[PDB]
Write a protein that binds this ligand. Sequence first.
Ligand SMILES: CC1(C)c2ccc(C(=O)O)c3c(Nc4ccc(O)cc4)n(-c4ccc(O)cc4)c(c23)C[C@@H]1O
Lengths: 805, 805
Amino acid sequence: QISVRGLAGVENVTELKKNFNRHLHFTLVKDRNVATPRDYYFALAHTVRDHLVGRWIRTQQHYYEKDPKRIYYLSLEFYMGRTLQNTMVNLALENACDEATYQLGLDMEELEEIEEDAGLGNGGLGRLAACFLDSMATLGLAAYGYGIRYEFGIFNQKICGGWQMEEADDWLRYGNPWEKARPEFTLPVHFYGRVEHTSQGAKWVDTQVVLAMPYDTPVPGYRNNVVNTMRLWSAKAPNDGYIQAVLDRNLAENISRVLYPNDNFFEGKELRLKQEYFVVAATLQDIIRRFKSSNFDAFPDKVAIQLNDTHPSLAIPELMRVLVDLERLDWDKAWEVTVKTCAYTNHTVLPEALERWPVHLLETLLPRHLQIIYEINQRFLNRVAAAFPGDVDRLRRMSLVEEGAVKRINMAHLCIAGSHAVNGVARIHSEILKKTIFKDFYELEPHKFQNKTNGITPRRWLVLCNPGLAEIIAERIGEEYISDLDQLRKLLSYVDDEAFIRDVAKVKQENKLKFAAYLEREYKVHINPNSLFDVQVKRIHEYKRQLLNCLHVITLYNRIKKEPNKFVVPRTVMIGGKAAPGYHMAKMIIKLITAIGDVVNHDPVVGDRLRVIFLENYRVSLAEKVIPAADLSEQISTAGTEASGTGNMKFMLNGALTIGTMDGANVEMAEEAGEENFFIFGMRVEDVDRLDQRGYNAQEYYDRIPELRQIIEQLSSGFFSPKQPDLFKDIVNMLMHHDRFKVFADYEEYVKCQERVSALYKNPREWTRMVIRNIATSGKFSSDRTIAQYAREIWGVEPSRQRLP
Amino acid sequence: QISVRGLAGVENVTELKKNFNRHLHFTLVKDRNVATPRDYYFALAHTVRDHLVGRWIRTQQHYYEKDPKRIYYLSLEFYMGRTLQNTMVNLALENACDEATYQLGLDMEELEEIEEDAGLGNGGLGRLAACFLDSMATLGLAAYGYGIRYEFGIFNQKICGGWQMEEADDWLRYGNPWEKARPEFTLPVHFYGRVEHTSQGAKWVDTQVVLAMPYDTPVPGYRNNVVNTMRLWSAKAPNDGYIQAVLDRNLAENISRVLYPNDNFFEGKELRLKQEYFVVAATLQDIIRRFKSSNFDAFPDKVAIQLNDTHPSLAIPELMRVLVDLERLDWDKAWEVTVKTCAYTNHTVLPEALERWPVHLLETLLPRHLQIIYEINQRFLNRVAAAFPGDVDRLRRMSLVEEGAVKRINMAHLCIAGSHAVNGVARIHSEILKKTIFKDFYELEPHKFQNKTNGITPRRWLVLCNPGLAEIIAERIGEEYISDLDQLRKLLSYVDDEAFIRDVAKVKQENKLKFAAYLEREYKVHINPNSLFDVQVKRIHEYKRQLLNCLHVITLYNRIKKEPNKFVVPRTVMIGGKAAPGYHMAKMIIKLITAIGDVVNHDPVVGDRLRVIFLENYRVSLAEKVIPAADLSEQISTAGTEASGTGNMKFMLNGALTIGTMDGANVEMAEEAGEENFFIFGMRVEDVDRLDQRGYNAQEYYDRIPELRQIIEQLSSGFFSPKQPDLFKDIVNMLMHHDRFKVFADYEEYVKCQERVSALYKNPREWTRMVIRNIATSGKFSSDRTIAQYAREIWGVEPSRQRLP
Ligand SMILES: CC1(C)c2ccc(C(=O)O)c3c(Nc4ccc(O)cc4)n(-c4ccc(O)cc4)c(c23)C[C@@H]1O
């Protein structure tokens, strides 16, 4: 069909059909008479997976033979999405399978919709892990993703009566054709117990054992014949009245049962601590076994462990435990190895996200790790005291141990102390780390602190989800950009090219029709395809300020009612994302969005000039549908709160213009494109700080802005909940009296900036030319660039995009 | 190698090796460098399973096209054992795979030892189900086995300190290459709730739903191209704080977690009741769907439901529930259909085995079924009252409702009332049913009561486990006997044939060396291969009288110590079998066996003249090893207690002579061979009854038998437990004062009969000639004969051993 999707060679298609039919017969045990579309999806998935196997085996053999330094990306989350299209793209098989299935009478895109997302993450951090796996394989790194094979990923969200309802994400119900169970590589993980100090040294005894069974999933690089591994551990009860004892095996196996759905929030649940140690303990056993199959001097030359947030921070004391207690290294040598092995990525400054585990919980579950943590703290604070003699407050601030009613271990402090590199995920965030929350650590060890601005893979996030845009780009500049995204800057040459302008707008219109067709087919929801698609998709949080979007939406509605005869650019305002189950405010915000829609979408004076829709069950596969259809990308977090963002980058790559604050990677996106090509508004970090310094008074904004006052009175008086007039009193009260994110303070600039958005959209040519200037400068935000930096600046390995044989 | 194992055709071997290597590469994702023997086993298993798929699909299509009456064998247990060798035997692939794997450098028998038993049964009843599936496929019946896919089968038994320890039988740990999950055929099963009576009729509402997911396993007939299905249901939570709710999905899924390990004993556990309804409800939905894909007049013409014991007895009220409540048939028409559809097989007369569920438990879990059961009872008792006017005691005795402190439903009475056929499992047992425990039901409906003497499949139980014996037989009479076992009578012609006599003894000696090698390799246990192998393997129960064997073993030991210089036939006495976890006496009996061995096996005066060994973890695969090696088959249950037995038949088919009571199918085995060819001893049923009539006094036997008195004093005084002198006081006390199975009353005849056993074994030629007379007359005990009778006398279908194309 389109060239970026590869060749449908005659023999390749013939072989694909034969292997499809073989799987249908021998694997699905069906013939065409009874085969369901799901049977067809699985026959195709097995056929495509078969094309990975040779390279997968040879890649891993190649690493065994050449012994490169191995990169271990440890994460509690791998937000992978679906795998069938990604595999075909990266194997150059997409047109061939499309033709093969077409000749069999099947629509391959219909089959693709049958695959369950591997929804093993919450949001940005977990999706970063997924993009990173893709980029590390495309860059030829000997890299392994290590995580948990959750039986249930992030919950499936249903909207019922305008409210979020959570259902179990039973993604393995029909099996997983991608993974390969490796029950022969199963390893014991220990919990509880107690420490004996013998003549040999310390001994961790009387533990309860949980087995960790690895499942390996292939990670294909982009057309370089590299296939790396994602290894996900599954909890299994050890082999050794009767019925209840068998049933009680469920308790240990609950360790890998379900992903904790807290996006940016720490709740010290013991089961979550168990999950974190589970990944850490089994993974480090793997790492050490592989290292010995090559004395621990060389260990940091052969192993990098990257900690995705503090979630696997126990790797630092676990590595010490293994090196000291089992390998009998001296403490100082073991510590030198550990710090040189480990590096730590921080993802947020919000204090409620910081993992601060109660000491008594650690003492019970992991008694030897708490001892090692205390020893780490004593030695680290001795270094602090020697560098800053007499600075007692600095000692208290830097300690891994936090005092209080509940004594706790600060896992971020543990990570900094035990890592040779610490990085934030965007320039502004990494500077904030050095300036504020880790300033003490930066002053002790400035060399540790780095920036690694996040990115997204242009395979999943352009070639896969927006083949039309990838094609019109390739028609001009070739296909090299797909793994060399800075070549998109060549498109600045085409900013006055009438053909490209036409094609960019044509592609966007096709994507919008496709998304409108999706909403009609799957939900019987009708959206005006000739409206500006205004999209805010991301997890629901106060700091991301979906509520500020809500205020603007009601402003548009109230201005229409005030002057019904005045032309306004028609909009479909779309908001989607999941709220954590126990986050009352976030669930109220979802209900407000649907409640606004219930009024707006049924007002005959409004008609199709304005519609407000909550996109249900936002997840990786839905992001791939809606982001290519978006005109306006809402990135409106309070300045200083969004460490980087990555949804912002997806929209930029896919031809939406961005309205946003100078926050996270927005800053660098605007720098890359030129601020004249972004709708930047609102307080900067400095202005937020000035408000905090004098005290944020929302009443002052209410008193001075009639249009804002009108909206608050509508919320209070029940205008958006006539049957329950005080339904939204908590939102109103938070906004008026307890708003940590200063919604009102950006209201006026936001509404006026939104006016400028509409003004440009009335000029289709100039809208599209500004779009070109964004797409053309999105190259910096490829995760290949991010990974190349991690490789050279932290891991000490040189990337390579050369083909394996 | 040997002809009964088929042809190793040149192209077949070449194709097998290619498909082996394809599976190793694409399915196991290994190359030969790293492949474990388990990888090799799985590559072979997939290769062999691939050879079933075409016939499996075509068999089931054939049934769809020809619409024969379908047989549904409902059982809570399918004691299947391993599947790889059985599949190769029945597909005529065994020599070809043997040669193919040999050319790849692999020992196929080593690979076979890697397969986990599908241990989904307890003993005779569950193994009968497995043999029946094999025979119904070999006889061309459109037959389906329906059961539960237990995550954990019968526990793995370890002997530790001479005691049984139970471990979870994690048979699915490495997967199951045989089964095909059918998650698309998943069905809802309902529990709890309540009954509404509307205008339409009754309605079962407010239930909790458990999903039943079917897994299909192929059942190959013997070289007739028939492949039937065993469908096993797996419990799954329905699709619709948060974390605990996800974890609590385990509660519904516990329904299929583990097989209840009670052999012959009813404990009214609610979870077991749930399992029973689970199989019943999902299976009958399948049956009805398949029936509609062909008005319910014709339903009994198209459906037979065979109830394996009372365990799926809820099928009777469930079928009524569906026909009346959902299909809106009148009660009387629905009842006519039900009784003509259902038939019931009874497996034991022991009262403690009878399922008698508390009415309050049924009312809570299955409120509509209890209503239907009460209505069934009222109408049935009305028939009783009309046939036997004024016989009020008969009404009380026959009622489905049993009065008492806890009111209960007698599930056997439900089965008789709701079934057009009731059968026992051996002639003596089926007569006892008509004479005693079901005499009232027999007098009301004599036409209902049948016999179907049990049998065993000669595929698994001769060709598979004893290929040497199968070969020397085939060398004389051809291979037709393998599915026409009455042709073994041709071997009576060879009773004076020196070559056959030589070969029979040679085969037995090879099997004994092979089993001795097994015990050395797997347990470092040394047995004298030139000793008589005296084997009692079966579940441990008082009624099977392992204790009587114990008394004889100690007698042999005490006689040796009394006259050390006197020659005795050397024996290896082997006892194996599992005790139910909560059955104290059975566990004490295992400990006594090992305690006897601890004295006997270490007495230098005894040496290798006598050894006593407890065979650990007796299961189908171990039965296949030890039964072909046995010289003497211990079948010594108290007359009247063993309904049939089937282990007795396995030994007879495999060249052991039998010592036993006139009990169960022993009677018919002795009738078939001639009593002169069996070591029959002990009380007959009539003598047991005479003892009960006057009261069994064990003291009288103790007082009159010095050698018995000596053994009891050794047990009491601690001779077999010096470190815990009163370890066996409970056994002694039961024997002396509470022995329901009259161990002492058969002691003298047993010991003297055992003398006759030894006397014949001293004459190898006459021992072997008597063996020939047993093997030659074992043909009646083929489960093909049993199934042919079920087909013609209950199900109304005609068997056929003709090939499918
Ligand atoms: C070598 C090659 C071209 C091929 C040719 C022929 C057959 C066949 O059976 O006629 C093949 C199967 N069989 C086959 C296919 C599916 C199945 O379930 C069993 C066997 N598989 C194959 C593919 C995937 C596997 O996990 C295992 C083998 C492969 C086959 C792989 C390869 O494409």
